[PDB]
Design an enzyme around this catalytic site. Structure first.
Site, PDB file in Angstrom:
ATOM      1  N   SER A  63       0.828  -1.189   0.000  1.00  0.00           N
ATOM      2  CA  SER A  63       0.000   0.000   0.000  1.00  0.00           C
ATOM      3  C   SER A  63       0.870   1.250   0.000  1.00  0.00           C
ATOM      4  CB  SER A  63      -0.915  -0.001   1.216  1.00  0.00           C
ATOM      5  OG  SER A  63      -1.762   1.133   1.175  1.00  0.00           O
ATOM      6  N   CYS A  64       0.355   2.310  -0.621  1.00  0.00           N
ATOM      7  CA  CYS A  64       1.110   3.544  -0.765  1.00  0.00           C
ATOM      8  C   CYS A  64       0.172   4.746  -0.771  1.00  0.00           C
ATOM      9  CB  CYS A  64       1.948   3.509  -2.050  1.00  0.00           C
ATOM     10  SG  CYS A  64       3.058   4.908  -2.276  1.00  0.00           S
ATOM     11  N   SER A  65       0.604   5.813  -0.096  1.00  0.00           N
ATOM     12  CA  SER A  65      -0.154   7.054  -0.043  1.00  0.00           C
ATOM     13  C   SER A  65      -0.451   7.559  -1.453  1.00  0.00           C
ATOM     14  CB  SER A  65       0.636   8.115   0.740  1.00  0.00           C
ATOM     15  OG  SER A  65       0.069   9.417   0.602  1.00  0.00           O
ATOM     16  N   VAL A  66      -1.684   8.012  -1.666  1.00  0.00           N
ATOM     17  CA  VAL A  66      -2.081   8.465  -2.979  1.00  0.00           C
ATOM     18  C   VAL A  66      -1.292   9.691  -3.448  1.00  0.00           C
ATOM     19  CG1 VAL A  66      -3.989   9.984  -2.299  1.00  0.00           C
ATOM     20  CG2 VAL A  66      -4.106   8.711  -4.429  1.00  0.00           C
ATOM     21  N   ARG A  72       0.821   9.481  -6.587  1.00  0.00           N
ATOM     22  CA  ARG A  72       0.205   9.545  -7.904  1.00  0.00           C
ATOM     23  C   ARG A  72       0.192  10.965  -8.477  1.00  0.00           C
ATOM     24  NH1 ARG A  72      -0.297   5.146  -4.272  1.00  0.00           N
ATOM     25  NH2 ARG A  72      -1.758   3.566  -5.054  1.00  0.00           N
TER      26      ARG A  72
END
Ligand code: ATP
Ligand code: ATP
Ligand code: ATP
Ligand code: ATP
Ligand code: ATP
Ligand code: ATP
Ligand code: MG
Ligand code: MG
Ligand code: MG
Ligand code: MG
Ligand code: MG
Ligand code: MG
Lengths: 239, 263, 250, 264, 250, 244
Positions: B158-161, B164
């Site tokens: 999981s990764c902080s948006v 993007r």
């Protein structure tokens, strides 16, 4: 918690004493059978694997070995689904008459071996379902018990390959079964060879259709030698 | 040395702390910390905390909350308002640090109120990372997790948006939801590892290269779907997800230089 | 009228001019004009001119030069500096008029200097800059439509001409985006590399640090073997991200 | 100089010679020489010679004979056995030169027996050894001048398909046999028959290594199994596809095209 | 008859031997043997041996050594020089047997020197072992594959090497001489290909040719790596890098 | 025999006939014939006839009419109703015979009514009609060579086939089932697949493509699926055997 759910399952079995477990070989009925064995002992558990034309011999043989391998006394029963005309003529309600014969046959065995209930593994008693087991609860508890072996291929009745109103025959089932088996052997575990008389209409997940192209010619010839005149791939994919 | 020595170091540090608050993300690392803390200190001495936020999916929070309960922990959800911090809202190159500060400020506040001696996270090779102190590498994490019977965790990193978005682009609820819906749609087609990089009117899709051969059957549907979410052009990054990680020796050297030229 | 009447009209107009300068792109229309000028006036009385410029590829230029030679014409190349005109450089909707104005201005200078009576282009029937420079479109004056062009080319035995429709590279840049020598070269080198892989129909749309590649959708399946080389090649041309438009060509 | 002068030089050299034997491949260059020779000396003074051999396809030879007949020339087919020379049979790096030596020797024998004054080829030392004349080259024809004069003469028919000696499918030092040559030729013909006109079946004893244009490899996958079986039934034990493709590195980015050239 | 009866036979044979040297591969079978040896004889009476060699990867050796530690056994690594035997070095159809001969010879040396009464391996009911007197106790107790899994589950065993390793000699034609260099180059190629997501692969050695074997179902996605795989294996020493049209085990 | 010899045989036959009616399809063979007739007899002594019908596409018909005019012929369109014949409409192995009868019958009426000496078609080597290319022994390679020598470059390059082949023998052709197949194939050609068959199996469409194209077709699966469903098919499929 998982520990709270296992106790519910442990307690429910203890109240029931002698049980007959409907055993599919999948992860869910595997968990039920092993928990039944652990709490009630091998003399109080009967594993039943149903053999029939609507599901593969590979699944039947795999389930029979796994129940013995888990340490249960295992019993085979053969259902003749096609003796039922609703199934034989594949009506939209065939599914119902099939389940009636299935549960009737296991209810007969349980009354005849002194069981207090028939058990199944739905997420008859579904003690996993009564104990609020999710798919994830099934995985954690089975690993905890040291369970690693079960049939991972989800089976579904072969009647779904035939249009409603189409008569099932021994020959139609065998032809579709061999075709789907050949296709799995190429690396496509999810597939359907939908039967349309002289046409086979193959369903693959759309994500797999690009990988399939190397096999086009071989699948065509193989399914033709099984009796299809035309072998085709559904542009819509699986479902 | 061996895993057992690494496990023993872990047990010893845990017992010395007596009461801990475990920051539980649902990944394999914090799961092992959470499992070990419960097992050595007992359920009454562990508080599992899952931070929910606007920068991550409700799907990851709910999955994490259920896994903490399933392991037998008291777990409490807490919500962080990352977009109230101006560095995060304007996505500066150090946004990550003020996010982490706001994160750790919240868990230390919770720990002080529940009588914990430390905050634990799952960092490996004010908060304590016991896996790092016990010299756990990624392979050590997997071995002890297998040994402990742990099998459920979110296997997609999981990764902080914020990643993007270009540095300097202002995050909004509109553009976040636009990015998340695009990623959710792509996952729904069978691509669990994907990024929809936002470039105003351009969507730049990153996939594992091993999957790009499969993707072509979805070109038109992804194009039209992401246009109705607000992009004008929908594109696929030719370098794919984690460009250079799979490349031969010479071209990983070349793409790493390309990636450094925009530092 | 018959093709024969249109051919005769074209022949008489050529005879009256005696000496001509033909703007030759290598396409079928100026190919027909050039072949007719040669047949009527002779090779000594025709100058074929191919314009080279920054907004079009060297491959289109060299191809036209060879084609004109192959028809038996004396051909001379000339270079236009379209970017010295700010109207072209600032890529507005009317940039193309200033490009054609500069083009016809150069052909009038060439025609004046070799003593031609007119500049000829291959405009056909169904443009301000052409008439203001006084160039003649004899196929258009003789009521040639596209099928008339094909019919006379067949009758003349012409079978080789450039079938690739050229487009100014300015279509790779959004309106209002300033054209520079570097960003033009960057797009041209990128498209030239992609064509060299077997994709003759391609666009590299410029979005600053993003290259957005347009391919015919039926070709994208073949492109996958080239992903990594195109990615690194176009980054080495200066793009930060190399992307493929999921929508395909145009 | 001008094209008209180059044509005149060619016409005069033909007239000085009066009787010629034209080595005719069917390609555009030897087609131009043959047409100009006929026009200047007349069919009775021109002999077209088409060489057939094991190193080239029967289709190209038959195609050339018909093309010379179409130009109105008295044509003679001759068969060469290139494999009788050990340099060719054992495929050394200079095998090509000894192929030309045998070729020009046979044409000189033909020209001496029919009373020609020279052998002509269509080139734009084996020729200086044999006495062969390249009149287009002596008249400074470039490729576009060849095209201009062929169009000006009304020539439209010639073999546009590039031929290449099959010896290129074999490593240096590998012995050519009638069998392995036929094996390679049969393999490439099968691959062309599937829609792949630009292809090589490189011979590596029990391995076939197929070179294809890389843009075609994605479509080729539908034929993998049939190609495997077909080329095995031609005698290869292993049928493989070159990951570098046809003319490796010619379609690579600058960095990895120089690294591919460095490895070679 | 039953798993319990088979387990009993194995336990008694273990007790009769008192002290054992266990050939440990990291796989499920020898994992079952090592766990049964530890539980019955105690950690001071069992020696786990993992053989390291040029015919297998360092990765599988590292996994097995680590797994034996995880089970609580004293484990010692030993290095075999398979290439010292000329039958192995020149890869004859009999190379396999001379490898096992050298293997069981080394295990007997270790067992005799630490005072063990037998070498144990993990052969089940479904050669050069009996030419050494090594004991396959699972086979003598009639364990089939289902019995190994049945007892491993009952013992709580869930961790073992699930990837079956295969001697690198299968990459070479019979008559081909194995060298340190060509073994290492074949191993690096397969490792690089595994790193791209192809865990089932073979790089068959044909001097200057690499012939890659992949499951046919993977070849559609593999195309995106063609050029990188080509240049990587050339940098390893192959002149040609090819893909077998027949696929895996053609 | 040399091409110049076969062309001379062709020239002599045409001169011998004086006035001809040329059955013109737009393909390379009848294009060569039409051009030679015009070149030898002049536009006044040649009538090009293009047949429009329900079993072939309106697009191929329009292309030929344009091609005939571009070739310099006075061209006449005529419409055949192959389906008015029950043998054709009931799609038996004898359908071809009645179709060819009806085709050559209409062309004979035209030729007799404008005073032509014969109907010409474009048959090549390998009835009441003259196939001068076949009589002069033109092969496919000779056709192309003479076409280039004549400067002919424009013709319909996709080989046409009666739509009745999309239906199994014994299946009755209808206006609706034909139109459904014609629309399906037209949509597919518009995506860049000029060679295709949509074989009709009532609620199943079985698409045939050249196998060499099937790898690229995948980007279109969903759109073809949806489009051929709105035309009335329930299942849209791809034949694994490819075209023919
Ligand atoms: N051949 C079969 N024999 C015995 N029981 C069966 C059989 N097939 C299905 N069942 C029983 O019915 C239950 C539900 O069947 P089903 O396979 O459709 O769902 P499932 O999610 O796959 O469950 P499972 O993991 O146990 O296979 C099984 O858990 C099992 O108890
Ligand atoms: N939403 C979150 N809620 C609670 N804790 C989190 C959250 N995200 C990260 N963490 C905690 O902080 C640590 C940092 O996780 P990070 O995503 O940065 O790397 P990671 O490898 O994914 O860690 P993990 O495997 O534990 O998820 C986690 O191990 C976990 O302890
Ligand atoms: N590079 C060029 N060099 C010389 N003349 C050109 C060039 N480009 C265009 N022209 C001239 O201007 C005319 C118009 O060219 P344009 O590309 O707009 O139309 P076209 O339909 O492509 O005509 P054509 O068949 O001659 O190529 C050409 O017929 C030609 O006479
Ligand atoms: N089978 C052959 N038979 C006779 N002459 C040949 C043959 N092959 C080549 N030649 C002659 O040798 C000359 C050199 O041929 P080469 O293949 O090297 O070049 P080329 O550019 O293809 O010439 P061309 O246009 O004539 O085919 C030809 O021009 C021709 O004169
Ligand atoms: N490097 C090795 N080191 C020590 N013992 C080995 C090694 N390789 C093989 N063996 C031993 O030889 C036995 C059989 O080897 P093999 O790998 O061919 O069969 P296997 O069915 O895969 O057994 P296993 O499940 O134990 O790995 C192993 O069970 C193990 O006892
Ligand atoms: N719609 C049509 N209209 C007029 N003539 C036709 C038509 N279709 C076929 N023909 C004529 O009958 C001959 C036979 O045509 P057919 O399509 O069966 O074979 P073909 O090889 O395609 O010939 P062609 O290249 O001329 O099209 C044609 O050459 C042409 O003379
Ligand atoms: Mg199941
Ligand atoms: Mg995480
Ligand atoms: Mg033009
Ligand atoms: Mg040649
Ligand atoms: Mg093993
Ligand atoms: Mg036709």
């Amino acid at each position: 918690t998982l520990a709270t759910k296992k106790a519910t399952l442990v307690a429910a079995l203890k109240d029931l004493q002698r049980v007959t477990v409907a055993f599919s070989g999948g992860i869910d009925s595997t968990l039920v059978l092993k928990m039944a064995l652990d709490v009630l002992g091998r003399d109080n558990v009967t594993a039943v694997v149903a053999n029939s034309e609507l599901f593969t011999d590979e699944e039947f043989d795999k389930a029979m070995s796994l129940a013995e391998e888990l340490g249960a006394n295992v019993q085979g029963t053969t259902l003749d689904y096609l003796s039922d005309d609703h199934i034989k003529n594949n009506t939209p309600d065939s599914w119902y008459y099939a389940k009636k014969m299935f549960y009737s046959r296991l209810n007969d065995i349980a009354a005849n071996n002194g069981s207090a209930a028939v058990l199944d593994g739905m997420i008859a008693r579904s003690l996993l379902q009564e104990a609020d087991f999710f798919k994830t609860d099934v995985r954690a508890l089975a690993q905890e018990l040291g369970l690693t072996n079960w049939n991972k291929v989800a089976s579904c009745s072969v009647s779904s390959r035939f249009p409603y109103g189409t008569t099932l025959t021994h020959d139609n089932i065998a032809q579709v079964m061999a075709a789907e088996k050949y296709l799995r052997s190429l690396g496509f575990p999810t597939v359907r060879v939908r039967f349309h008389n002289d046409i086979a209409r193959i369903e693959l997940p759309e994500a797999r259709i690009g990988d399939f192209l190397v096999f086009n010619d071989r699948v065509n010839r193989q399914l033709q030698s099984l009796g299809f005149r035309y072998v085709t791939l559904d542009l819509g994919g699986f479902r």
